Amino acid sequence: QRAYANVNTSLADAMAVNILNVKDARTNVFWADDAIRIVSQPIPANHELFAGMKTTSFSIPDVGLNGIFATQGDISTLSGLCRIALWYGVNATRPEAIGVGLPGQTA
Amino acid sequence: ENRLESILSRFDADWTASDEARREAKNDLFFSRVSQWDDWLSQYTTLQYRGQFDVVRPVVRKLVSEMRQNPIDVLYRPKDGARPDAADVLMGMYRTDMRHNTAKIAVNIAVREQIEAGVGAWRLVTDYEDQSPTSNNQVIRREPIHSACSHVIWDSNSKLMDKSDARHCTVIHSMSQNGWEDFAEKYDLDADDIPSFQNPNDWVFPWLTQDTIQIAEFYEVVEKKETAFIYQDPVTGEPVSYFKRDIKDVIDDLADSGFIKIAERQIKRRRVYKSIITCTAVLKDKQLIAGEHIPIVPVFGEWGFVEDKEVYEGVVRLTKDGQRLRNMIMSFNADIVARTPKKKPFFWPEQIAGFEHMYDGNDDYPYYLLNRTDENSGDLPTQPLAYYENPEVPQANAYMLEAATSAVKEVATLGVETYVFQDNLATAMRRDGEIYQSIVNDIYDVPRNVTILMAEVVDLATGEKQVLNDIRGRYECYTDVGPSFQSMKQQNRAEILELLGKTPQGTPEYQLLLLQYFTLLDGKGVEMMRDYANKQLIQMG
């Protein structure tokens, strides 16, 4: 267990915790490339919400993601619905690798 | 009045009229190519055992191999009353520009789709070749069309197997971003304005990415009377007929070269126009292409009409129910085998209280001990020991597995042999021969053979472009089907061998043997042998 250590000592009762963001400041963000990932799954075509719809794939430009273009029709009001659903999750697997740059942290 | 509105109305009518067959063919393709558990639309389904114990695929493989072992290609033969060698030039050109890998691959893809779904197709295109051109710095290549059922849409009022009476046909091309960019570069389109058209393929299997960009090519053939010019041949002969749509930039150069106009006649002919369209605009309007026919050749399996409506079937449509039932029964049996309590005894806890380590499953004891006395009931009641019954496959399950397998085996027999499918392929190849002959007469430089040599009567315009000149005596050869040969020399060798096999050992046998030696490929020893044969043939007069 000790092989995973990252700090010299542990929290010992009344340790003063200093906040490091003292002023409003737009961030500058640095990281290692593998610290952030995007987990993506197209919504299954048999999902209870996308039941009566005729689903197809739908690629998102620039980013490498694919969502679902679903579509359904109605007789009584001779109308139609379309729905582009993109399912994704941004995950920070290495926060210790992700960083933030805060300039102008004046008192 | 709108060209776009008219084209889209025609396409909508045809796509609607050809909906059932397209859906069935797509289902057959998916079932026989990807997976037999086509339950993508089934909602509220958890995950259970779904095996694939295939019994249809070996039949499809056997049929594919049987039709692979017998290649079929066009064979041009001189018509009745024409010269005996009226088809040599056309046959040589056809073999030269159809010997390549692309033609064979397209035919194989069409045949496989015909066996599996029931319909396939391929296309003929003309390209500019500068290194090894067939004729007039051009080549003709046969390209494949994948999923013809959903990608090639024919005219609805076409009651022919080869669609030679249909006048329009829309081919849907789907690609990714890079494919669309290179397509636009090739066709001088606008790459930035992404196109869109009717999506021809469904999303069934969990593919991460499908085709995104869609476009259509609408071919229409128009039969009309156009002016023909009857010139007089200055090189040698009597009048040669040329059309007026061509011989346009050289209409004044013919007179300079020495052609004198004799008369003017109106002749009815067919012209093909291609238009590149999307769902909202027409990119190319009426670009005239070469040939008298739509360059798309379809191949069919079991084809017919039910009620003003086309139906085509392969070998997989009628086996799907039995195969699915077999898969379901086998999955149920696997569930029975897996999730079923095994054969173990039933015990009251007080019967084995204190001896529970004897029944754990070791082999350290000579016998098992059971408790006998109870402090309140005097003695433990006596009852025969029960065991959980072993798992059993139901008689219904076994009978239905056997019956479904028998039904699939009975119904998955194409014919008795693939004779009907080979005949349909031959019909497709005859249509291919017709289309190729039209394209050759339109773009190639076909020499005319005289009985007085080959006279290539050609000329160039002031812009250095070469304009072909073809007389109206161009349909001197009709179409047939023969074995596929890679070259005219190979065909000649086959013909000589066939004649030799029927000629008895007389003087014609010697003549044909020497001819076979003459028509042999060259090395060094075979070079000497062929030189000897040539000397003998010349010396024998």
* Coil/strand/helix, residue B500: helix
Beta strands in B180-292 (DSSP E): 213-232, 240-243, 260-277, 287-289
Distance (Å) from the C-alpha of residue B317 to the closest C-alpha of chain A?
24
Residue B308, by phi and psi: left (phi above 0), alpha (psi -120 to 50) or beta? left
Q: Are strands A88-92 and A99-101 parallel, antiparallel or unpaired?
A: unpaired
Query: Cβ contacts (< 8 Å) between B43 and chain A: which residues?
Result: 46-48, 51
Distance, C-alpha B166 to centroid of its chain = 19
Question: Out of B41, B208, B209, whose CB is closest to A45?
Answer: B41
Judged by a CB distance cut-off of 8 A, whether residue B205 touches chain A is no
Half-sphere exposure at residue B122, Cβ-oriented, CA atoms within 13 angstroms: 28
Q: Which residue of chain A has the CA closest to B39?
A: A46
Beta strands in B278-354 (DSSP E): 287-289, 296-300, 302-305, 310-313
Which residues of chain A are at the B interface, by a Cβ-Cβ cutoff of 8 Å? Answer: 42, 44-48, 51, 55-59, 66
Structure tokens at B62: 């056997």
Which residues are CB-contacts of B396 (< 8 A; sequence separation ≥ 6)?
none
**Other C-beta atoms within 10 Å of B477: how many?**
21
Distance (Å) from the C-alpha of residue B176 to the closest C-alpha of chain A?
10
Which residues are CB-contacts of B303 (< 8 A; sequence separation ≥ 6)?
B118, B119, B161, B310, B311, B312, B424
Query: Cβ contacts (< 8 Å) between A56 and chain B: which residues?
Result: 199, 202-203, 210
Q: How far apart are CA A6 and CA A22, in angstroms?
A: 26
Contact B208 A66 (CB under 8 A): yes
DSSP letters along B437-479, please?
HHHHHHHS--PEE----EE---EE-TTS-EE----STT--EEE
Elucidated via: cryo-EM
DSSP letters along B346-370, please?
---GGGSTT-TTTSSS-S--SS---
Q: Decide if B149 contacts B21 (C-beta within 8 A).
A: yes
- Please count the residue pairs, one from chain A and one from chain B, whose beta carbons lie less than 8 angstroms apart: 31
Distance (Å) from the C-alpha of residue A44 to the closest C-alpha of chain B?
8
User: Would you say the C-alpha torsion B424, B425, B428, B433 has a positive or negative sign?
Assistant: negative
Distance (Å) from the C-alpha of residue A56 to the closest C-alpha of chain B?
5
Q: How far apart are CA B201 and CA A34, in angstroms?
A: 36
Query: Cβ contacts (< 8 Å) between B209 and chain A: which residues?
Result: 57, 59, 66
Query: Cβ contacts (< 8 Å) between B199 and chain A: which residues?
Result: 56
Q: How far apart are CA B252 and CA B221, in angstroms?
A: 30
Q: How far apart are CA B52 and CA B335, in angstroms?
A: 14
Contact A59 B202 (CB under 8 A): no
Q: How far apart are CA B422 and CA B61, in angstroms?
A: 16
Substitution target in B19, B39, B42, B43 with the highest count of A β-carbons within 10 Å is: B43
Q: Decide if B40 contacts A45 (C-beta within 8 A).
A: yes
Q: Are strands B72-78 and B477-483 parallel, antiparallel or unpaired?
A: antiparallel
Q: How far apart are CA A68 and CA A55, in angstroms?
A: 6
Report CA-CA distances (Å) from B470 to B90, B241, B243: 14, 8, 9
User: Would you say the C-alpha torsion B276, B281, B283, B289 has a positive or negative sign?
Assistant: positive
What secondary structure letter does DSSP report for A80? E
Query: Cβ contacts (< 8 Å) between A55 and chain B: which residues?
Result: 203
Q: How far apart are CA B96 and CA B284, in angstroms?
A: 32
Q: Decide if B143 contacts B106 (C-beta within 8 A).
A: yes
Give the resolution to one decimal, in Å: 3.2
Q: Which residue of chain B has the CA closest to A40?
A: B208
Distance (Å) from the C-alpha of residue A66 to the closest C-alpha of chain B?
7
Contact A57 B203 (CB under 8 A): yes
Judged by a CB distance cut-off of 8 A, whether residue B208 touches chain A is yes
Backbone angles phi, psi at B305, to 5 degrees: -125, 140
Closest by Cα among B74, B76, B89 to B470: B89
Q: How far apart are CA B220 and CA B274, in angstroms?
A: 7
Report CA-CA distances (Å) from B250 to A19, B30, B247, B468: 88, 54, 5, 10
Question: Out of A45, A48, A58, whose CB is closest to B40?
Answer: A45
N- to C-terminal Cα separation, chain A: 39
Distance (Å) from the C-alpha of residue B415 to the closest C-alpha of chain A?
38
Q: Decide if A23 contacts A105 (C-beta within 8 A).
A: yes
Contact A46 B41 (CB under 8 A): yes
Dihedral angle over CA of B211, B213, B219, B220, nearest 10: 120
Q: How far apart are CA B26 and CA B29, in angstroms?
A: 5
Q: Which residue of chain B has the CA closest to A47?
A: B43
Q: Where do we find the tokens 């050289």?
A: B250
Question: Out of A42, A45, A56, whose CB is closest to B199?
Answer: A56
Which DSSP helix (H) or strand (E) runs through A92?
strand A88-92
